[PDB]
Amino acid sequence: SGAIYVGNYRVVNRHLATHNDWANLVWEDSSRDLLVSSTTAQGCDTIARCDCQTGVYYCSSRRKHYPVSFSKPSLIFVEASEYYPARYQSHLMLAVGHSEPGDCGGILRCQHGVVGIVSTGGNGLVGFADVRDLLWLDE
Ligand SMILES: Cn1ncc2ccc(CN3C[C@@H](C(N)=O)CCC3=O)cc21
Ligand SMILES: [Zn+2]
């Protein structure tokens, strides 16, 4: 689990969105595994606006942060799970590192701020849903 709080927005993995997230929906995209809902309280996470390919992510299944090199956001095939059939997930970045399904929502950050959240993995590869292109999160 995990979310990003920026301004009057909350960003979460779409497959983990709650009834309240859907009742206050701003935007969702199944192909990216993202959903953004509105909040009353003001969030103060900073979103990175860059093309970094190195950063640190939080791994709840190890209670540890790990530095990684990651690919640029791209369309990657993702095997079926109980939340989606087999499909291409867009805006996804992979890195070599540990993750388990419950690790979704862990944040990946570079020196410029939040880059994305854990969304896929397996076979020693962790995948992050990018949020750097959602410029509207800052207004
Ligand atoms: C985060 N992670 N680390 C290992 C691993 C193995 C399997 C999965 C399967 N999966 C894929 C997600 C998607 N974005 O399509 C939806 C939720 C989910 O359980 C995730 C995994
Ligand atoms: Zn950066």
Side-chain angles (χ1 to χ4, degrees), residues 111-134:
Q111 56 180 128
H112 310 94
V114 172
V115 171
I117 51 172
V118 176
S119 179
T120 73
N123 293 328
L125 295 152
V126 48
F128 311 98
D130 187 47
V131 299
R132 300 177 288 189
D133 67 316
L134 303 178

Side-chain angles (χ1 to χ4, degrees), residues 15 33 78 81 83-84 87 89 99-101 104 118-122:
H15 71 280
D33 185 42
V78 175
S81 68
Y83 311 88
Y84 301 102
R87 78 214 209 284
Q89 173 162 325
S99 76
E100 292 172 43
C104 289
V118 176
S119 179
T120 73

Side-chain angles (χ1 to χ4, degrees), residues 48-54 70 109-113 115 132:
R49 300 302 181 193
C50 66
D51 63 358
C52 282
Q53 284 185 251
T54 67
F70 52 93
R109 299 177 71 92
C110 62
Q111 56 180 128
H112 310 94
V115 171
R132 300 177 288 189

Side-chain angles (χ1 to χ4, degrees), residues 85-102:
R87 78 214 209 284
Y88 286 87
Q89 173 162 325
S90 64
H91 300 264
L92 190 53
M93 301 170 292
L94 301 189
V96 172
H98 181 64
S99 76
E100 292 172 43

